[PDB]
Amino acid sequence: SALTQPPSASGSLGQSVTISCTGTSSDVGGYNYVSWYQQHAGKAPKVIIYEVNKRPSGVPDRFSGSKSGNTASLTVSGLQAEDEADYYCSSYEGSDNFVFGTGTKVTVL
Amino acid sequence: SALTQPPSASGSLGQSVTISCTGTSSDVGGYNYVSWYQQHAGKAPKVIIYEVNKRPSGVPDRFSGSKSGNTASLTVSGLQAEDEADYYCSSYEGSDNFVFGTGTKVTVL
Structure with a gap:
């Protein structure tokens, strides 16, 4: 999953x-x-x-995370060309287990 | 502003x-x-x-909101065709004043 x-x-x-x-x-x-x-x-x-x-430590305040319901989100502000990257989430899911997302490719226009 | x-x-x-x-x-x-x-x-x-x-009252559970720092977020889950619309935010800003955003047009593909 x-x-x-x-x-x-x-x-x-x-x-x-x-x-x-x-x-x-x-x-x-x-x-x-x-x-x-x-x-x-x-x-x-x-x-x-x-x-x-x-x-x-060392990650600046232009990266912000939130959640509500069953959805988390990441907002990257002050976008730089070098923010073009794949971004993945993960969550704890009980036991000693984590589940990851499938990744989002960001383009900086 | x-x-x-x-x-x-x-x-x-x-x-x-x-x-x-x-x-x-x-x-x-x-x-x-x-x-x-x-x-x-x-x-x-x-x-x-x-x-x-x-x-x-009457708004379904699939609309949810959050914030972190200076950034608020709205998630619409279970997207339906009727969710294609403009979405505006507002915030209190002291006194009896509220300030609005310029709106985001959501498309549902």
């Missing part, structure tokens, strides 16, 4: 893009343990958000 | 879309008084969310 993410999203340089991540009451809707990751092609993933809305 | 909203968003039938509403610490980021409105052009608006995440 997988969390549902749109294939694609886009926003303007300097503006924002928002990505959704839809699960169920047993994952996204059940806990406050949603993370987001950014990956450029061929590069290492990077954690952007954890615990729904927390940014790791 | 308006709240910033993307001019467009889209999602697939039966799935989800999330749209954003970005203000400042004096409005969206200052209070828990974000509302969302749906309007099919030419027709009367309807309130979908108030107080960030509250649904008026």
Whole structure:
């Protein structure tokens, strides 16, 4: 299984893009343990958000996470060309288990 | 001066879309008084969310709201053809004042 993410999203340089991540009451809707990751092609993933809305040290405030219902979202503001990347979500889902989304490719226009 | 909203968003039938509403610490980021409105052009608006995440009586559970920092988000899940519409946000901004966004047009594919 997988969390549902749109294939694609886009926003303007300097503006924002928002990505959704839809699960169920047993994952996204059940806990406050949603993370987001950014990956450029061929590069290492990077954690952007954890615990729904927390940014790791060194991740700036232009990355914001939220959730409501069974859907989490990530908004990337102040868009830079280097924000063109794949973005994935994950959620805790009970036990010691996590489920991931299928990734959204962002284009920066 | 308006709240910033993307001019467009889209999602697939039966799935989800999330749209954003970005203000400042004096409005969206200052209070828990974000509302969302749906309007099919030419027709009367309807309130979908108030107080960030509250649904008026008669609004289905599949519309949900959230915020983090200066950014509020509305998710429409289980998208239906009737969800193609303009969606506006507003926030309190002190005194007896409310400020609105410019609206996002959602398409349902």
